Structures are given as C-alpha cells and as structure tokens.
C-alpha cells in the first residue's frame, strides 16, 4: 500500500477546498494549468482542481479531476486504469523521462494570485 497525507501543504494542496473556490482562484491567478487538490468524503478520494487560459475558454479554463476508488484497495478517474493511491496514479500518468525538473503545474490554493510573469 502507499499513503501521502502529511504536514506537506505548499499551495496546490488544500483541506476541503471548494471546487468553486478553486475555479475562481484558478482563473484569478491566471496560471494556464493551475493545479490544486482537496480531500473528498464519499470515497475519501482526492480531487485535483486545475485551470488554464488556453482552451475552450482561452481566457479561463478549469476542471476538477477526482479519483474514484474500488473496494479492491485501488483508485482511478476512469476504471480503465487504477493504482493503490491518488499520488501513485498522478505519478503513473506522467512517467516522463529527463525533460522537465518539477511535477504539477502551478501551486495555487484557495487564494494565492502571484503570477511571477517573466
């Protein structure tokens, strides 16, 4: 098995962050690809709130990806594939080689409109 919940809490992580608060703070931050996460309740799974300004909504796109869990100690956003934890799933999604130097897109939470813009 594998866990992940701990003291860690940079920005993308948030204790019970409202999906709507993520969308507004996401669009408000203006980071194309903002990424946030919060605990659920029914399955006790995690939800990833990410947004961007370059898609169906060129000026503000958002979507909360959640993880479903089956009674076989597994999780997934689509039964097509499922791991034993949310973090394990997200990591299994990228699995890219030496190309970048950091996962996730922009660590933003309930409120953190920084936007370095360089």
SSE arrangement:
Elements: E1 13-14, H1 19-29, E2 34-39, E3 46-52, E4 61-66, E5 68-70, E6 74-78, E7 81-83, H2 86-94, E8 106-107
Notes on the structure:
The PDB classes it as transferase. Strands 1, 2, 3, 4 and 8 form a five-stranded mixed β-sheet that branches. The protein has a three-stranded antiparallel β-sheet with strand order 5-6-7, covered by helices on one side. By secondary structure, the protein is an alpha/beta fold. It has two helices and eight strands; from the N terminus they run βαββββββαβ. The termini are far apart.
Q: How many strands appear in the DSSP assignment?
A: 8
Provide the domain count.
1
Give the helices and strands as they follow along the chain: EHEEEEEEHE
What does the main sheet amount to?
A: 5 strands, mixed
How much β-strand is present in the residues? 25-35%
CATH topology: SHC Adaptor Protein
Quickly count the helices: 2
CATH homolog superfamily:
SH2 domain
Q: From the helix content, strand content and strand pairing, which structural class follows?
A: alpha/beta
The CATH architecture designation is: 2-Layer Sandwich
Percent of residues in helices: 10-25%
